């Protein structure tokens, strides 16, 4: 079926890479397909299953991005203003000139990737943000940034008047369904988190950090990622708002060379070449500032491109594609970070292979 075309790649991928375990979920019309292969730990070759929870790292910010745009669709949260708008405590910076939807975008003056190792808490970060000048012109280059992605998450809450992880599930991830997606793995499903491993083989878990749960902090299933990318697929039942809010995430903003920076979420026209998608997730494009060209014949969420997501901590690589005109979409999640090249070229064998490009 399906899994020989899938179960083949999968198999080759895992042993050029050396990937304890997979867990993969495939979305089309007529279903979601579960796969999960290997183990979730090397050590004690506890099989991957469906409850294995992965780290998803960098695809975290999808999460954060939907929020921001219910909030947004709620008529909570303007996109456009100054984030000190929200976050009075900024008024004064930077921020008077900086706004959700760049912070979405990763296009807020240069806000650089890291957070500082000076910020260790919620107080010593506001005072960052409010010293710090911005080095790129803001809405024209594209830097990406957790420190920005953050500071969504916290307008975010601020404009819920919530706390960002509690009006997550309230909101977004119990309305999807996602009952496997944790900030803070339960001590009752230790035993279901897989240990990551890093490029050197070794073992390794992420620590938590400051705006964790805004830009990296995401354990959870392929199955529940799947729901996510169903709704965005408009292969679920969802509430109106949560589907607009969805749909938003999708809205092409900005483009940065050959790739569309939508909310996070980043895509490209098809035709497709595999390489232009390996430069999206290479040096050149997430490690130094591109220039950024406002979308003003102003795009709704396209039928015709391919999107998507890549997903790292030290010991985990996840990877989300959709391609809407198919509603068809791939989850892969591994207990190893693997080089993007091949995350891309598994993707697109895959999606090909079944026939979706
Ligand atoms: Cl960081
Ligand atoms: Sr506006
Ligand atoms: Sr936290
Ligand atoms: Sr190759």
Same mark, same amino acid.
């Given at each position: 079926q399906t899994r020989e075309v899938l179960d083949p790649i999968v198999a080759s991928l895992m042993e050029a890479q050396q990937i304890p375990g997979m867990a993969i979920a495939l979305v089309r019309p007529e279903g979601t397909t579960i796969s999960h292969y290997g183990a979730a730990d090397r050590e004690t070759?506890?099989?991957?299953?469906?409850?294995?929870?992965? /780290?998803?790292?960098?695809? %975290?910010? *999808?999460?954060?991005?939907?929020?921001?745009? +219910?909030?947004?669709?709620?008529?909570?949260?303007?996109?456009?203003?100054?984030?000190?708008?929200?976050?009075?405590?900024?008024?004064?910076?930077?921020?008077?000139?900086?706004?959700?939807?760049?912070?979405?975008?990763?296009?807020?003056?240069?806000?650089?990737?890291?957070?500082?190792?000076?910020?260790?808490?919620?107080?010593?970060?506001?005072?960052?943000?409010?010293?710090?000048?911005?080095? /790129?012109?803001?809405?024209? %280059?594209? *830097?990406?940034?957790?420190?920005?992605?953050? +500071?969504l998450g916290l307008e975010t809450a601020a404009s819920l008047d919530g706390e960002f992880v509690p009006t997550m599930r309230a909101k977004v991830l119990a309305p999807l369904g996602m009952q496997d997606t944790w900030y803070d793995v339960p001590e009752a499903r230790m035993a279901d988190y897989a240990m990551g491993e890093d490029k050197d083989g070794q073992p390794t878990r992420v620590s938590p950090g400051v705006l964790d749960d805004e830009a990296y902090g995401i354990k959870t299933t392929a199955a529940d990622l799947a729901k996510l990318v169903r709704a965005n697929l408009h292969l679920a039942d969802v509430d109106a708002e949560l589907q607009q809010a969805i749909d938003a995430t999708r809205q092409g903003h900005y483009r940065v060379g050959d790739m569309t920076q939508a909310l996070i979420w980043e895509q490209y026209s098809l035709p497709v070449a595999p390489e232009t998608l390996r430069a999206g997730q290479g040096?050149?494009?997430?490690?130094?500032?591109?220039?950024?060209?406002?979308?003003?014949?102003?795009?709704?969420?396209?039928?015709?491109?391919?999107?998507?997501?890549?997903?790292?901590?030290?010991?985990?690589?996840?990877?989300?594609?959709?391609?809407?005109?198919?509603?068809?979409?791939?989850?892969?999640?591994?207990?190893?970070?693997?080089?993007?090249?091949?995350?891309?070229?598994?993707?697109?064998?895959i999606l090909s292979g079944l026939g979706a490009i």
């Open positions: 070759g506890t099989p991957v299953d469906d409850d294995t929870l992965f /780290e998803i790292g960098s695809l %975290s910010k *999808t999460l954060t991005a939907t929020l921001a745009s +219910l909030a947004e669709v709620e008529g909570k949260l303007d996109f456009d203003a100054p984030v000190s708008r929200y976050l009075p405590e900024l008024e004064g910076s930077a921020f008077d000139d900086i706004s959700g939807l760049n912070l979405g975008t990763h296009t807020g003056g240069g806000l650089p990737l890291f957070v500082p190792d000076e910020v260790t808490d919620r107080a010593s970060l506001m005072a960052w943000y409010r010293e710090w000048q911005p080095t /790129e012109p803001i809405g024209e %280059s594209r *830097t990406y940034s957790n420190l920005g992605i953050g +500071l040096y050149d494009m997430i490690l130094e500032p591109n220039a950024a060209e406002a979308l003003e014949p102003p795009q709704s969420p396209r039928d015709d491109v391919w999107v998507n997501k890549t997903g790292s901590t030290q010991g985990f690589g996840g990877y989300i594609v959709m391609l809407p005109g198919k509603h068809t979409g791939l989850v892969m999640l591994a207990n190893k970070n693997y080089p993007n090249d091949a995350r891309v070229e598994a993707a697109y064998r």
